[PDB]
Amino acid sequence: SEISRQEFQRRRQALVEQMQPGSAALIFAAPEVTRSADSEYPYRQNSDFWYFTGFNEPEAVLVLIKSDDTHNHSVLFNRVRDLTAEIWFGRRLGQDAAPEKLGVDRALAFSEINQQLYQLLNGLDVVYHAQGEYAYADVIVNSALEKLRKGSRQNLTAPATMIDWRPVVHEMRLFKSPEEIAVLRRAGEITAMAHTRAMEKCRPGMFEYHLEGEIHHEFNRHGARYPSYNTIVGSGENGCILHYTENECEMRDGDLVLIDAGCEYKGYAGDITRTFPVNGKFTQAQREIYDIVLESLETSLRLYRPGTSILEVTGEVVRIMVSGLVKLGILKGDVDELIAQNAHRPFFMHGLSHWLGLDVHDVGVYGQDRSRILEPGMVLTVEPGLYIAPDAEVPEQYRGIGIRIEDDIVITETGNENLTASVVKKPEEIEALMVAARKQ
Template identity: 35%
Template sequence: MKYDSINSQLFENNRLNYINKLKDNSIAVFNANDEFPRSGDQNFSFKQNSDLFYLTGIDQEQTILLLFPQCPNPNYREVLFIRQTNDHIAVWEGYKYSKEQAVATSGISTVLWLEDFWSIFSAVVHYADNIYLNTNENDRAALEVPYRDLRFIRDIQGRYPLHRYERSAPILRDLRSRKSDIEVQLIKKACDITKDAFVRVLKFVKPGVKEYEIEAEIIHEFIRQGATGHAYNPIIASGKNANILHYNDNNQVCRDGDVILFDFAAEYANYNADLSRSIPVNGKFTGRQRDVYNAVLRVMKQAKAMLVAGTVWNEYHEEVGKIMESELIGLGLLDKHDVAKQNPAMPLYKKYFMHGTSHHLGLDVHDFASRYQPFEVGNVLTCEPGIYIREEGLGIRLENDILITEGGNIDLMEDIPVELEEIEDLMNS
């Protein structure tokens, strides 16, 4: 791994919080993600299952976690099964965890080879009444691939049809949304690396540069500082491309007079940042660009102030919509009389601001959390309003990552330039 080792206390605490939510006499199993084929004999880069990483810190394929807190054999109350390495694997693939390293990383004292899983599981499962299994229940997911968890469920239910089966996901949805101090530090590290990449880009951009050249500068800074890489596919959208919300082509020339919309961030130790900024290619905003930029910035500041414990998701987004509505009227994009007569279910502002303002952030960029639970202390949320004017070939989005605390909120990106004058000064320094 590129990142520094993480204190195993994080994962020990996470497991304790999880097992305290289980029904009596329950066993739980978590699987690593699949290794997905790319083409020929190549696989995509491995990305660990976020729930397994949350509970173990193990960043390696072919891993299983077994938790049975009331197991009559104390040796099997926490068991980590990992892939057994050998000389051939060492030569062709390199580093794999030894048992000792897996113990140090996870804080789990019983580490066995993966090939022992079914024999151990079969020896203890009959002493459990409930079996907790995991699936991806992120409500943004649209899954068509029969991934490892689904195959494991079919297998285990076929072997043990008379046990009661329970879902781990609702427990983890509650736990993962509240970040511990260590998790906040890891997210902040991802934010700090993202800041350095953004400042690097500010000094690099000029008319004639290609979007993918900017992308190269970003990944250079990420890898140089030990980030895993991009938190998500980076958006480097110049001119009219900024009106494509998930623009990833990044293959156009940045032209004098245009604005570039950036949406990129680093992943560090599997924890993610999420940043959006909009900058002028030539280092100077036009009058119209300044007006739109400052309108988005005002919405961002007012929305950010609402990210406090107790705020309700839907009510928050409705309030942000009203603020945006006012700004769009001020920009001449909406008519206040039309707004007064609009269908509340289809507000007119959505023509220019069609996405949500915030989402949870953590091990996943769109992190696992309930959109029906009021915001809580420990939540980390993005704040990302935008205005997209297709007829003007202009799109502006600004985004920071916000931690909710008992005393209000903390902007984890407060030191990343966002004021218009600061952007221009840095670009022209």
């Protein structure tokens, strides 16, 4: 699936609808990024610029101008077509094709932006600008405004009001359209397939990075070339390290491996975690911790729906975790008192859920303690985990165990839709999947 020309147009108009008359919104592309010396990382467009354009070049600026409540138009600054520069550094859209391709009224060369931007802003009352997002963008905007302020003899005037559009745009991004949900649906599926493959390929004696290799190959073959974030493959005690991305250890018989990986498909993030035994067989101790995390996930999946919140669902998970840990002798005391003193926190130190979209930790207001009431169209993760340090003062058999299970969901009218349930998570289904693969 993909985003249509008409959708990009609808988004631009939804922003313009919220703008004051006599205003302009400026949305800048991401700069290119050095990896080492003259080599650059694969280009990643700014999510907000992408959201309004689907255009994957640097040195571009979308300018939306609202004259009044009926009249508005768009100007794109982008790199010019150059025979030599493209033979070398790849094809460029240019100014002639841009209006039709990207649905903008006017396209100008980015090399002319300082000569042109101030003319577009002259006489307007408001400029919408994400100040501080990029230094190169702030320089450009500040120069334009300075030319206008100081140009009274040339009959120039600067808009006195500057408004950050990020709160408005991020509120838009928080609610997914049907097109976006279909894309995320595909991202979840591609990501699930990768996690299934990793489970099937896994053997003791491989390195953690081998499973990363399988995962990335799977992303790529469905047309999702890049991960949405750096892949985590934490086996044994590496599973207790939340942002373990070294993936440098040999996977040992008797250890669990925690895999957190997600593709980026048409700009949108998948985000799945699965934890499973390297040898295809949960031990009793591993199973005992796993069940607590699974129950937490399964219960959260039942509960998530409009009218509740991440805070509220989290409270239920905490109860499950504390009860489970008390039954295993990992915690000692009264469940309610332990809950009151957040006794689970040494073992579950992160949030249960984050928004998901064009960024893996997506934009949008959470409310205090993530108390915002959920509504249809919100997309989020559900990712309970339990991490028992190698030196934790608990029954010895639980030490050095890190387990997280994470799905991606969209809130619907009546509940939620799980976008990542096509990869197994019940322990017996994990074992059966692995057995079958090892036959073959």
